[PDB]
Amino acid sequence: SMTSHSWLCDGRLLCLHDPSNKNNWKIFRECWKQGQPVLVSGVHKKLKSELWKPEAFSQEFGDQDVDLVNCRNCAIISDVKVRDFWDGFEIICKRLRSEDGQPMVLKLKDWPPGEDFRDMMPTRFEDLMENLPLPEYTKRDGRLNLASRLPSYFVRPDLGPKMYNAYGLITAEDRRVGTTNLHLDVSDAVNVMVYVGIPIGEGAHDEEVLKTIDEGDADEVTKERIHDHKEKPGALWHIYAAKDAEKIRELLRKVGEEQGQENPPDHDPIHDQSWYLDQTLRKRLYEEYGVQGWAIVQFLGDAVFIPAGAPHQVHNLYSCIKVAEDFVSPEHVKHCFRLT
Ligand SMILES: [Cl-]
Ligand SMILES: [Cl-]
Ligand SMILES: [Cl-]
Ligand SMILES: [Cl-]
Ligand SMILES: [Mn+2]
């Protein structure tokens, strides 16, 4: 039976089922005021699927110059064509190879660049912005988005949206690597999974994905969306409450010191964007500092809401196209204030 919502993370995470339901705000706002993330499923059913394919991005924009990141070692591949990324998105025999002769796991950096999404891709911009869930919060001029209404005493977000494109992590060694390392944002964000590419060539890569979700601490209900509904899983997130950010800095300064880093006692390991919390570090955070997070699997068409100030990291299971919009809710405006 169709239902308005359900719970993940053993009741700690709201999952809304109908992205365009005019009554969603009634269920959302209680959870949001407490500093919790929220998941909304089904956004892919609202979109024009032909606008969000890797082959279309390659055909239309393939001659642009871009930099890539090697996710395994953080090395930068400078000044290549954007088709060199897109044509290896699903077909492994077309990926750029490292020295060892293996195909690389690549992230496309800052594309489209800065604030240029709307000018470069007007039809994509319209399709996304007209179908975002919780539109009073998430649209540029929504009644509950303060972004356009605040003075310079507040850090204001850039004009969006921002696209996040990267291959899936593959091997057992890759389990400990991030697609996007642990960081925080002073604005709220909504992050939509618009495409998941499950490859061919080294296709049959199903079993390392299940060990990653299990060791990642995913709940039993999330393990059912795979085995029962056959939905496409994109990315594993870990999100932490804004109130736990300083305890996470204390753990990472202790671990940086153990690993022979020489950092001043006040340096900020979250702002540095240099860490990925693997199974070992997530257990140490819980046991030694008393901090629990939310482990979230983002499937095709899932919208993740990330509260301002909340530390979070992202690990792609398969090749992903994500599109994210920043906003400033009244519930979390304290996090972008420039005084006290
Ligand atoms: Cl808060
Ligand atoms: Cl377009
Ligand atoms: Cl709303
Ligand atoms: Cl990163
Ligand atoms: Mn972020």
CATH number at residue 150: 2.60.120.650
Q: Determine if residue 100 is labeled as part of a ligand binding site.
A: no
Place of tokens 């059912």: 224
> Is there a binding annotation on residue 5?
no
**237: which residues sit within 8 A by CB, 6+ positions away?**
294, 295, 296, 297, 298, 304, 312, 313, 314, 315
CA 25 to centroid of ligand 3, rounded, Å: 5
Q: Distance from the CA of 190 to the center of ligand 5, in angstroms? A: 10
- Give the chain's domain count: 1
- Please count the other Cβ atoms lying within 10 Å of the Cβ belonging to residue 173: 9
Angle at which helices 245-258 and 279-289 pack, to 10 degrees? 120
**Centroid of ligand 1 to alpha carbon of 253 (angstroms):** 24
- In the structure, ligand 1 is a single-atom ion and the residues with CB under 5 Å from it are 35, 242
Q: Which two tokens stand for residue 205?
A: 């890569």
Ligand nearest to the CA of 241: 1
Ligand nearest to the CA of 34: 1
Strand 38-40 to 13-16 pairing = parallel
Exposed e or buried b per residue across 246-269, where buried means at least 16 C-beta atoms within 10 angstroms of its C-beta: eebbebbbebbeeeeeeeeeeeeb
CA 324 to ligand 5 centroid distance, Å: 9
- Work out the burial of residue 198: count CB atoms within 10 Å of its CB; fewer than 13 is exposed, 13-18 middle, 19 or more buried: middle
Q: Any idea which ligand is nearest the CA of 56?
A: 2
| CA-to-CA separations, 174 to 69, 71, 144, in angstroms, rounded | 15, 9, 40
**Dmax of the chain from CA atoms?**
57
Q: How far apart are CA 103 and CA 52, in angstroms?
A: 24
Q: How close is the Cα of 188 to the center of ligand 3, in Å?
A: 14
Tell me if 185 is assigned to a ligand binding site: yes
Q: How far is Cα of residue 215 from the mean position of the Cα atoms in its chain?
A: 19
CA 179 from chain centre, in angstroms, equals 9
Ligand 3 centroid from CA 33, angstroms? 14
- Reduce the DSSP state of residue 244 to 3 states and report it: helix
CA of 184 to the centre of ligand 4 (A): 11
| Structural domain boundaries enclosing 177 | 1-340
Cα 181 to middle of ligand 4, angstroms: 4
Residues 6+ away with beta carbon under 8 Å from 119: none
User: Count of residues for the chain?
Assistant: 340
What is d(CA 275, CA 102) in angstroms, rounded to the nearest whole number?
Answer: 24
CA 141, CA 147: separation in Å to the nearest integer? Answer: 8
User: How many angstroms separate the alpha carbon of residue 30 from the centre of ligand 3?
Assistant: 13
